[PDB]
Symmetry: C2
Amino acid sequence: MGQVGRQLAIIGDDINRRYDSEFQTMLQHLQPTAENAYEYFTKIATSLFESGINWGRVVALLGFGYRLALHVYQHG
Amino acid sequence: MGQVGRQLAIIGDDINRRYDSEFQTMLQHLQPTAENAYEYFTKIATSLFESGINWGRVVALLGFGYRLALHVYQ
């Protein structure tokens, strides 16, 4: 339990360090606003899952959406 | 774009390859059943976040929980 919790922390911190900078760049090429962010996310979800759905892709979309939310906060 | 959906698939498929086998190993060392999955998850969750919380840890917990549910379903 406590040991697996720490291993999840290592995986979690690993996910952060690997892809967080990749999301920032994906948001720059996007240039989203407070009026296209929801439709962009919804269309991106359909486009992603059309080629297949797995837990990694769901987890990638959730992290991207959270980073999308932060980007629209900071540059809106 | 629909162009971004294709790059998320690459990240998503990479996330699956990178950690799915590690999630399997952590689960078969933990050996959970239906009678104990909920308490194990909720204690694993709090202990994880009391060391710090960021979006990677949140999604790692979500993916772990999904594979946890799959392990108990056997």
